[PDB]
């Protein structure tokens, strides 16, 4: 969760992506907008003789 520059409208709670996954949320207690990024991942290759 990071700080985001998105300007949410007051009737909006969640922000969606192109794949209809939640990308930006609004915290209920404090009204800052949070941006959600999936954790670091990638492929692994093994080079062996």
């Amino acid at each position: 969760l990071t700080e985001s520059n998105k300007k949410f409208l007051p009737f909006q709670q969640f922000g969606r992506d192109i794949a209809d996954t939640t990308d930006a949320v609004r915290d209920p207690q404090t009204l800052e907008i949070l941006d959600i990024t999936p954790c670091s991942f990638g492929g692994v290759s093994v080079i062996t003789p």
Binding site: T2, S4, N5, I18, D35, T37, S40
Partner: protein
Amino acid sequence: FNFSQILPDPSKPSKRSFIEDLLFNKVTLADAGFIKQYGDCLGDIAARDL
């Protein structure tokens, strides 16, 4: 015969000819992510990228 337009130009850092430079400029090849290995793709920067 003049081959200065298809022989490689040593002034270019990529060592490509003039016509090869035009052929590479005409095709708008995407970075495709092997160039974009940087971790600021994870952070929210610029606009939404495909």
